[PDB]
Amino acid sequence: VRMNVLADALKSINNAEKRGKRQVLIRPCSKVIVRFLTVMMKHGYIGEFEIIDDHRAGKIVVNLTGRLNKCGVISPRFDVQLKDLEKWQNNLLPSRQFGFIVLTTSAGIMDHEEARRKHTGGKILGFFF
Amino acid sequence: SGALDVLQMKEEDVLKFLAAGTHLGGTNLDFQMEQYIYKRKSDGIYIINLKRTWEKLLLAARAIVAIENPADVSVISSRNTGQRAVLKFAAATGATPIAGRFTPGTFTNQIQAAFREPRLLVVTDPRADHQPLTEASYVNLPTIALCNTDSPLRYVDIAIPCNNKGAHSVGLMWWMLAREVLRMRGTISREHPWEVMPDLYFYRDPEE
Amino acid sequence: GKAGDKEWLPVTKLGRLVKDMKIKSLEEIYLFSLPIKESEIIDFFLGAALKDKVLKIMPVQKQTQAGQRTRFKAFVAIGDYNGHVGLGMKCSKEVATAIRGAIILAKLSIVPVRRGYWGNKIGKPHTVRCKVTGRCGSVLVRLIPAPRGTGIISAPVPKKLLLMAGIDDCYTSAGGCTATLGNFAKATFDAISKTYSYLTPDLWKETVFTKSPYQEFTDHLVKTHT
């Protein structure tokens, strides 16, 4: 069955972009999916998206450009300690310079750069570049 | 429209097309061709969109102009129904030829005696002419093509839906292309009609 | 030097532009993705002052009617020191030919490398923009950007290829049967070549681009023959 819903949305995306696709319909969506789709959006890795309202759990249409090499999800959502964030981005990001680790902290779902600036930390959601 | 008016449909042409039985289309659609399809006739057969067949043909024509050296557009057919057809196209527009057994190593392979470096290939059956369509994709050359409803779309950018089951459908479409290209960047002038009878394109064949 | 230059004559329009001093850098070819079939083209545009190192010799064989056969296989790598490299394997009757052909093969294959900054981009790129990996029949090489002074941390054979490519500093990790040298070098070759394929945010924006020297030079590249 389902343990997580994010992992499906992310994968669906990745296969869309790999095909050469410019849109996807993910299902079923969640506040966390929105928040993650949103961080991606702010940065350029996707275009605009749209939450369609079935009387159920939702369905999202993402319009994607093609700046996206990969958006992954980290499971389980490990706790990170401010100097485990430095260790994570190195593990899974292309160059020190770019790509984001996106985690969930007490003060919001955020990319790790925003994390560093706020100076808060938490549990790791996923990534992209 | 687009480029602005006259260039639209002309009953005169929609008449030659319907006459030549182009739009008739294959019973097996194929997925990448679904757009061309107007409607499915009862007793299985599909009606191609001549309007669409038209406009793409013009789009093709335009891409053939813009190649500066007309010789280096290669019109190609191993199919019989398209052999006199392409020979004629090459006579009018610059356009060098490749009929019959394409001969493998013609695009890749300097050494060979049919070595050609076209800047544009136009093919008549993507299934029969698969070799040229493959070789072309080994060396960055764009492709116009003859496609019925169930033809390979791989490595062909620009299709002009036809009928290619045959008759004059293959004749007319090569005719109209040459007619179109001579109009554009040529010198027919006055996207007015033909001193050339389209039959001149069209397959020959046998003798008793 | 004086030995009497040959008389290259070109099969290919791309070649004519090159000899004519119409095409001056490989970049034109690379941007256009023109295929290169005449080795001299590579030779004229670069390669001049590009050094070729022979990586391996190992012999093989297959069975005849009346028993055996055996022959020499040479692995050659070519590259300046900056940003260009190629790799060629050949097997031939004689070592000299095997090497001579291998070099030709390597040159045809010459590939772009995108070299980048570990992070603070001062005084020009020392390493790689991102991390790129390549696989060849179960060997896989991963290149990782590294800080200055790190150098090429790779096996000797790989270090040699990366060196010619013109990479200063890079971390590597290799998995698979590293022993089978032809495979390992091939994967690393794929790895480096992949750098151009990476799209970074720097690259995000587009472009009238180019008309292609083939088109502009078109007359030029139909001489007076046939």
Next chain:
Amino acid sequence: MQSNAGEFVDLYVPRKCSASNRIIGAKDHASIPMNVAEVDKVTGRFNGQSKTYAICGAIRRMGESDDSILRLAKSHGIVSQN
């Protein structure tokens, strides 16, 4: 690809597909674009002045290059009701 003092380094900036916005990289010679002529309106008279699109090896091997051209040609004309 800036350097220290806003300088432009490494060695080239590749063209990007007209359909997928993905780098044409650099030795993939199973890919090409397509110069469409501009017309001096009115009609005929090829006048330059290319309208041009570049299509990736990928799209073409997946049995697109064509349509992509049409989204491309109509969206920017010519081509209408496609």
Next chain:
Amino acid sequence: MGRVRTKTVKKAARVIIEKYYTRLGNDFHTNKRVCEEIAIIPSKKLRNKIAGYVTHLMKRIQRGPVRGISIKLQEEERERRDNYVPEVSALDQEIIEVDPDTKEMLKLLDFGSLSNLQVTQPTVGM
């Protein structure tokens, strides 16, 4: 059989015939003289063997076009033959007979035409 002409011979025959058809003949004796005029052949046995096979060809050509040989005269002959066209065959005779739907094909194509209806029955696969 035992005498199967080899390429060096067979080639020369195709060769001469291509550039010599109106000169050459039906008869061994004369081409043999002709090969002296139109070709330089080193031994007499070869030249004979050539003259001979090319004659066997000429004998065949002069009874039906042969699989891989072309000469200016044969091209001209095919050219003229490849003209034919009668009263002409379609007509098709007053009135096309349609299969209907093909009738509905015109009916919903905005197109007048001649007519006839006989289109019914389904319709097995295989």
Next chain:
Amino acid sequence: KDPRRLFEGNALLRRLVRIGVLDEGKMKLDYILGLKIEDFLERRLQTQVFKLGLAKSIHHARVLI
């Protein structure tokens, strides 16, 4: 600016400069990363006693010292 990075970085630099091993623009960390062995080796006695006549050999120098 990170008290740890500031306090120790500046110190490493100042130490590296007192010995001449390092220079100012270097004299930031971004430059030590792009440095080498000669730069140290150049500061030993032996090569200096050459470097101002008072030896005329890296040789002479070491036996002198």
Next chain:
RNA sequence: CGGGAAACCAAAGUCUUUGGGUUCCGGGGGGAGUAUGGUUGCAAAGCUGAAACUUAAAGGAAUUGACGGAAGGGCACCACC
């Protein structure tokens, strides 16, 4: 497309760009499913399961000959008729 050493594989794909859930077994080959204790069995046997010692390849896949009392094969009085 993509995977795999390939044979192959629309799953053996989405695996160095390595992270959807869970469960099980393997770490060179032989000694060995053997010894020994436990357990189940009327019995035959089953489950769990070592070591000492032995040894540098065991093995997989593809490629090619050689060779066949495998199939279509041919050719020659150095073969038969």
Next chain:
RNA sequence: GCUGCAGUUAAAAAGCUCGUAGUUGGAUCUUGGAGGGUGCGCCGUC
């Protein structure tokens, strides 16, 4: 072999399923303007 292994054929998915512990669990409840750090010659950049 957490990070970071392999198990169709190489050493390795129990004949199959039920099933407690253990592990694992769908969507959904709040919505430019200036202050301070270091670079570049009174101006600004981040």
